[PDB]
A paper describes a structure:
Detailed characterizations of mature E18 particles, the E18/FcRn complex under physiological conditions (pH 7.4), and the E18/FcRn complex under acidic conditions (pH 5.5) were performed. The ectodomain of FcRn binds to E18 with high affinity (equilibrium dissociation constant [KD] = 343 nM) at pH 7.4. We found that FcRn binds to virions at its canyon site. VP1 and VP2 interact with domain 3 of FcRn. Specifically, residues T89, I148, P149, and K256 in VP1 form hydrogen bonds (H-bonds) with Q142, K123, N149, and Q143 in FcRn, respectively. S138 and T140 in VP2 form H-bonds with R140 and K80 in FcRn, respectively. All binding sites that interacted with FcRn (T89, I148, P149, and K256) of protein VP1 and T140 of protein VP2 were conserved, while S138 of protein VP2 contained an S138N substitution in many prevalent strains worldwide. The binding of FcRn had a minimal impact on the overall capsid structure. Rotation of residues around the pocket caused by FcRn binding initiates pocket factor release. Consistent with the SPR results, mature E18 particles bound the FcRn-decorated liposomes under neutral pH, and no further conformational changes were observed.
Residue numbers in the entry:
A (entry chain E): 5 to 17, 22 to 47, 60 to 98, 105 to 170
B (entry chain C), F (entry chain C), I (entry chain C): 1 to 238
C (entry chain A), G (entry chain A), H (entry chain A): 5 to 280
D (entry chain D), J (entry chain D): 28 to 69
E (entry chain B): 11 to 260
The structure:
């Protein structure tokens, strides 16, 4: 199966919301207003709060004042899969080796550097993708 | 004895230190060193070697021999479209990485020097054409027409007896060293190939020929800052 | 060690030479000594400016990285290793000194003053052996650790130092790791050529990351170590000096600031703090 | 730096200062000299 | 020059479109020096009996051919006095001049990386196990790469990689000569004796692999010769032989 | 081996030590040093540069461009009152601090040398006047009249073609070095400006002109004891 | 330190000299500089390749052995000592660097960054003295320890280092321990002359084993130490360079691999990551 | 460092010179090289025998004394100090190397790798300061300690070293302490002139005792330290070499042995382990 | 004092270090060194000494004097069968180990050089015969016939006045040093003895004679890597 | 390496560099010279 959190946020709105799909079925519906991982749950809530803070800092990272609908497909397929899209177009990906986001888009490097400024955020993403996502996938497969 | 003060940087295992150390086997008689051919003394000597570039990263075409072959064909279709187009940085560009030059750079953090891209024609001997390969320095977008390509640095390759014309891209970097990693600052230009003239082939010759790009390094090429390669990413114990 | 220029003897002057009367509009600071504008005595001044050089001013080592990495159990996370994209900006004390100059070519001594303290807890009975700490400088673009026990800690080519707690702090002289010929403490340009992307010094002088961890695999009870990386810029070849930073620093990625007064406000333009 | 404090040759420092290279081993391995200006074949 | 002639031993190789001869890493082959020697067995030095171009079996370059690899000291077993001396001697040193002849007309498209890779330790299709010798060394026929990933207790002949888990297109660091049918009708790689030890067993140790990997698949229009062979001739010049003993049962 | 005794001051990270240390990257090829213009080799070279002094620390006037402008006017009102009055110490005086000379001193604990205060007139070219700027050495109170100002060290500035007359204050310190911090001992004098003659302006010229003070350092200027600047006072992590 | 060759000045050329037009089919990499194919300026290049030599590339010390050996009670087992058949292959970081070359003659600095952490348990009250660790290199064919208190730890002839925790990591320069004149990082041959047996580098370069233990006999409560042997290959005389390993390593005895893409896949042959 | 003699070139010989045909009955080992009996080539051999000298063979330091001395309470006994009548025989690893020669004059480096581990117990809460260990070499005939706190530990003339746990192991170069001009590793004579008394090496080379203790008076809970004395015989002037010991050692006072096979038994005189 | 940085490899007891150390007894007057005959300065000098080889490892025959005696007899039975057959490696071969050369090698990990096997006849003086002793280099199987033995390296020993003909086996190793331990790679050849002619004895002379093999080392012999001997395997305290 | 930092001769380093050998003590101990080429007895 393939676990995929559909991270999404809007700079000028539900400011931030996650749609965790363990397979084609959706199992997690996180929202910024609630601040909790509404369908173990505490750790996922903390991780998604970190992701929400990263998305807010990414919104601050973009120089343009126009709307920005940031999206992402974070997860692991049992292999980590990180694909971030700005305004509905993929712009950056998280390199596991170098352990940092990037792409040809200038906004990709701006957001990657802004998230790198956050304390251990790149390694938080490394733990989330390489370790936390497969751990949650296996735990949910055994449980369900 | 002699008064000595333990300066900062003591009782530490710096990974990049050249400190001496007592030997495990004193007065050990090492095997006499024979003249083994191929004494590599610099990693750039390995980078300097023309190495086939997987230009064609298309899905399925990679993890194969279609990755290295640039499909150059006899046709009127998409001859004002690039034969290939990638970024010049051997470090983080998916095309120029994972080769002698690219993997050599990936073991470092800063690189410099001109890159020679040797384009070897693999087709029929009767096939004749002209391919214009252009390195565009950063500051503008990737070339979208051959008109935009000839403005920058370009080489016109006449397919023929040599058929291995090399675009030795220059060093137009703002800084002395570029960044191996994906850095928008001090990034390299873009390599785009176009059809100066269509490769005319006789009826007996195949229409679709191939091109192999060879990334190598010049006498001007150098790297500065050592680092662990991000390519490996060892999962665990072997 | 050349000392200051001695105040030359001077007397009453009614000449047409106007030392005081000059033009600072030209951009030239007046080179007048006290003798030029005042009648002074001949004093052989020995006030050496050796400690006032950029080599000595930057010679003082100041803390640049403060983070708390932990040793605990087998539930390895991102809190067991300290991650730092090596940048002077992190701590303001040395950031202001470096941002007193636009470009500085220097070899940087990195001293890791690791301070390990057991985290306060219900159970602290543990008697752990002397903790060994690995401080690895990952080159820019090289693989970075994902966990405290990842393959990236096997430093085949990445520089690293293993230091045992209780010894001298691990001092490693990192050479001039810059793509350019200097370190741009300020970079008025952008990351990308399209005038977009990241803005500031962070785009250039992309020094590779530094990862600190406990070489000891685990600890019966959690122990938090403060890495406290201090930088000593030596072999300074500083270029284009800049005024010391006025506004307090807000972020380590940009010079973005909350507007501050030029200087401490005073009651009136004629207000002099003086004894009564 | 050049001073060796141990009699064993294996105990000496890394020869970092030694910059030698012969790219002609791998970049110019042909038996007959191939001049850049001259045509390589015929 | 395009035309060339190599007269090593009894055999003689004549070429008309061959590219420049490559000497492996720039060192011409030579007999093991006394300063560089480790054995005192007075090795025999057949100047022409063993130092001659042995023509291996012709291999057809197909449109779907991924590539091939020969283990040279081994491939030449039971092929002339070089193989006989391999059987009869424990130690052996030789510098191999590999002329790979792949002739084609002017209407044939393709290019082969004919690279001599010293100690090209190949990977196994099932990584846990290790392939038998019948999968690495040529066994009545050269071993052929595979276009995609393969399984089973065989050599991982995936032409996707170089066979050692490494990039195939990066193999040009090792001495090589491309057979481009436009230019090259043959490739000439002169590899000196390349080994860590001064001499090693020619059956126990595989000195190198001649990997002929078509990067551009052979494409030819109909009517042209479909059977385009890739012959391999190898001349072990300076074929020194120490440790003379009973013939190995290989 | 050689008997060595660990003297006091061992296994310590003194912040002001010049001990050597093994390098992280041995035999690292640093980027060649180009001649970048502006090689600053002493911090006093930066202090020596005329730097506009925020003399007018009045509330509201600071955090603005009114802080640097000394408002000198054409009038009979308060012309026996100081144009400005502050303390000479660049270190702790709110006026002379937070500038090149002042912030340069704040990074040290002891300073010495003459300070040049260059007074640049910013007004109409037709405006003409005389301003008497006086440095009074410590021992008495701040000058309250121009009569008390001319007793000490004073310069009479004739507003005109130059209009940048500099009061290069002398070194009348009792000790070789003064204290950067607020120390009653070895403190500096006071800078007070007065109207030697009223600046007469034509009807077409503005009555209220301005003066900019530039704090710089002479060839005699030096500092002794390095310290962390009290200006920053970093709250926490950035 | 010889620098790179300076780019010679060049101008417009319509000559019969074809620098770009060459033949890479010959196996010769074209030696053309930018001046040869393009009109360039005369720049005196000072980009030294000192850190890009095999001596400096292999000079960086990278971890090669990670194992956890334990101190606990009197029930001595195989977990109280760490066993390693000394081979670069174990950790991939330095394995790839070494497998960038077929043969390398070098003296190998072996630094043991021992990190002792008490194993998490119900009772951790113990206050053990400073742990002393013995790192003995058993020569190939020599006796190897069967237990943590075996006779083989009495190093009459086997090299060994006793290191006290908290000091500088134990650095021992092992000389060129090879039967041949180099280390075969790749060995395309077999172990036996009958074309059978073990295949790969493991047959040759049979470096002797390394055994690590706690010189302290026992500990009131179990303490796990991570040996973390790091290798620094110095005095490099590398021969026959090889491309850096593409596929991730699966085993430390063979180069057996799961097929990997040549390089990162891209959308199309004309796909260039560029700012919009 | 003189290398081995190069194999001289040889050809077919039908002369009356019989190199192979010699007489080992004379007690002379034949000095024939491969050239003498076989036709060989001229190889310049550089196989140095530097590491194969008695200086280098004995240079490897091997453990010679293993004992457990304890720190506990005030009930001082004989278990608080480790006693050793300094003799190479104790540990077989170096005993065999020394018993490869009848007489050896050498200065002996004595390295004490003390490993202190708290004895497993119900209560291990103690937090003891860093243990200091005294290693005193009592001269032969000098007073020896009766308790851990006896007057003999006051080393007025007996050599001693105080080592703090966690530092480099205490290495003391003991000089040539022998009444004779060599050390008799074997002494075929008796202790007394009446052909009685003690038999063996123990009678001569009567090296003085070595006593190891904790300089710390007591420990809240018992801690056992393993002294692990390793010997490095340097400045070797070995005389009368002997074959390496065949039978396993049974006692450290005599060469008394349980009869062992000359060598590993094999199926038949014509049995060769060979690949099929 | 002098600033010193604790380099890696500090506070460690490397077993193979030549570091100096303070002496227990300073200014100790060592006993004057007399010229004791038999000064052994290299372990290979001991290896170079002809030492009787327990060729006959047959069960029961070992742990006795039958181990060293090679039973060569006057008969027609099994005269096309090897007199003896073992492996040449003194390190791990059960026959050539546990002797001066073999035990000397067992204390090391890498060995090199020619081995002289001196074959001493122990029989009646009237006995006369010819024994062909052959060292076969690796690559093939152990010799099974004298025809396969004479192909490799062989010596024909004519039993007579000398009766101590030595097969000085050559160095036909692929590498400069072989492995002392049981390594299939860089292993040595095989020593097999055969009856070139049957040893004819008079009726008064015994039919079954003996041969003693003496393993010694040449001037070319050397070892490289020190190690602890696997022979001892000390069980515990003595 | 050759420098000795302690006055005691027993404190010096191991004489690893000293490669001396007289195999004629044990391999050629006969009183009368025995030449390899010449017959050993008579």
């Amino acid at each position: 199966l393939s676990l995929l959190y559909h991270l999404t946020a809007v700079s000028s709105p539900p400011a931030f919301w996650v749609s965790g799909w363990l397979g084609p079925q959706q199992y997690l519906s996180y929202n910024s207003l609630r601040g909790e991982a509404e369908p173990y749950w505490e750790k996922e809530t903390t991780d998604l709060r970190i992701k929400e803070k990263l998305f807010l800092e990414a919104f601050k990272a973009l120089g343009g004042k126009g709307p920005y609908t940031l999206q992402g497909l974070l997860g692991c397929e049992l292999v980590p899969t990180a694909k971030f899209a700005l305004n509905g177009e993929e712009f950056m990906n998280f390199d596991l080796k170098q352990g940092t986001w990037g792409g040809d888009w200038p906004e990709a490097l701006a957001i990657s550097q802004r998230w790198q400024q956050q304390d251990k955020a790149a390694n938080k993403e490394l733990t989330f993708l390489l370790f936390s996502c497969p751990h949650r996938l296996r735990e949910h497969l055994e449980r369900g | 004895g002699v008064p000595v003060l333990n300066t900062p940087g003591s009782t530490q295992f710096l990974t990049s230190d050249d400190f001496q150390s007592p030997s495990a086997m004193p007065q050990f008689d090492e095997t006499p060193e024979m003249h083994i051919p191929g004494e590599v003394r610099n990693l750039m000597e390995m980078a300097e070697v023309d190495s086939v570039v997987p230009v064609n990263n298309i899905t399925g075409k990679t993890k194969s021999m279609e990755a290295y072959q640039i499909a150059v064909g006899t046709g009127n279709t998409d001859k004002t479209k690039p034969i290939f187009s990638f970024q010049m940085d051997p470090g983080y560009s998916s095309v120029l990485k994972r080769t002698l030059l690219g993997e050599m750079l990936n073991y470092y953090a800063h690189w410099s020097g001109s890159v020679k891209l040797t384009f070897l024609f693999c087709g029929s001997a009767m096939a004749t054409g002209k391919l214009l390969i252009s390195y565009s320095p950063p500051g503008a977008s990737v070339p979208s027409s051959r008109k935009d390509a000839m403005l920058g640095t370009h080489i016109i390759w006449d397919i023929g007896l040599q058929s291995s014309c090399v675009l030795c891209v220059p060093w137009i970097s703002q800084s002395h060293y570029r960044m191996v990693q994906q850095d928008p600052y001090t990034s390299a230009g873009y390599i785009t190939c176009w059809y100066q003239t269509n490769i005319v082939v006789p009826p007996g010759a195949p229409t679709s020929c191939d091109v192999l790009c060879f990334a190598s390094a010049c006498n001007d090429f150098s790297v500065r800052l050592l680092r662990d390669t991000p390519f490996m990413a060892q999962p665990g114990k072997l | 060690d050349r000392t200051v220029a001695n105040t030359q003897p001077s007397g009453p002057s009614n000449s047409k030479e106007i030392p005081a009367l000059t033009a600072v509009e030209t951009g030239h600071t007046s080179q007048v000594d006290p003798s030029d504008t005042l009648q002074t005595r001949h004093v052989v001044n020995f006030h050496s400016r050796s400690e006032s050089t950029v080599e000595n001013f930057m010679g003082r080592a100041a803390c640049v990285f403060m983070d708390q990495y932990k040793l605990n159990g087998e539930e390895t996370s991102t809190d067991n290793f300290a991650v730092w994209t090596i940048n002077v900006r992190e701590m303001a004390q040395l950031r202001r000194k470096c941002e007193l100059f636009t470009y500085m070519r220097f070899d940087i001594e990195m001293t890791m003053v690791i301070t390990s303290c057991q985290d306060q807890g219900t159970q602290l009975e543990q008697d752990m052996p002397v903790l060994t700490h690995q401080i690895m400088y990952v080159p820019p673009g090289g693989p970075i650790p994902a966990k405290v026990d990842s393959y990236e800690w096997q430093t085949s080519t990445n520089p690293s130092v293993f230091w045992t707690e209780g010894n001298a702090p691990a001092r490693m002289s990192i050479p001039f790791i810059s793509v350019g010929n200097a370190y741009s403490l300020f970079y008025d340009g952008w990351s990308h050529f399209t005038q977009d992307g990241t803005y500031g010094y962070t785009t250039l002088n992309a020094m590779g990351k530094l990862f600190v961890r406990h070489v000891n695999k685990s600890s019966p009870h959690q122990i938090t170590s403060t890495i406290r990386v201090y930088f000593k810029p030596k072999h300074i070849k500083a270029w284009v000096p800049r005024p010391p930073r006025l506004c307090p620093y807000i972020n380590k990625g940009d010079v973005n600031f909350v507007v501050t007064e030029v200087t401490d406000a005073r009651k009136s333009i004629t207000d002099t703090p003086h004894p009564e | 730096t050049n001073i060796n404090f141990y009699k064993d040759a294996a105990s000496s420092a890394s020869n970092r200062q030694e910059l030698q290279q012969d790219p002609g081993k791998f970049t110019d391995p042909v038996k007959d000299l191939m001049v850049k200006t001259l045509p390589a074949l015929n | 020059d395009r035309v060339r002639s190599m007269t090593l031993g009894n055999s003689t190789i004549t070429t008309q479109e061959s590219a420049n001869v490559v000497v492996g890493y720039g060192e011409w082959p030579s007999y093991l020096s006394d300063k560089e020697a480790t054995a005192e067995d007075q090795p025999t030095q057949p100047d022409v009996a063993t130092c001659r171009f042995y023509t291996l079996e012709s291999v057809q370059w197909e449109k779907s051919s991924p590539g091939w690899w020969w283990k040279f000291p081994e491939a030449l077993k039971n092929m002339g006095l070089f193989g006989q001396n391999m059987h009869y001697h424990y130690l052996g040193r030789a510098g191999y001049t590999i002329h790979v002849q792949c002739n084609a007309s002017k209407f044939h498209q393709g290019c082969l990386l004919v690279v001599c890779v010293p100690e090209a330790e190949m990977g196994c299709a099932d990584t846990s196990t290790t392939f038998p010798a019948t999968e690495l060394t040529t066994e009545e026929e050269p071993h052929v790469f595979t276009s995609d990933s393969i399984t089973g207790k065989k050599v991982q002949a995936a032409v996707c990689n170089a066979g050692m888990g490494v990039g195939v297109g990066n193999l040009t660091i090792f001495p090589h000569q491309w057979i481009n049918l436009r230019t090259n009708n043959s490739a000439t790689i002169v590899m000196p004796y390349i080994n860590s030890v001064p001499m090693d067993n020619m059956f126990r140790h595989y000195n190198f692999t001649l990997m002929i990997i078509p990067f551009a698949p052979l494409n030819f229009n109909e009517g042209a010769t479909a059977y385009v062979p890739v012959t391999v001739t190898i001349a072990p010049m300076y074929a020194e032989y120490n440790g003379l003993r009973l013939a190995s049962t290989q």
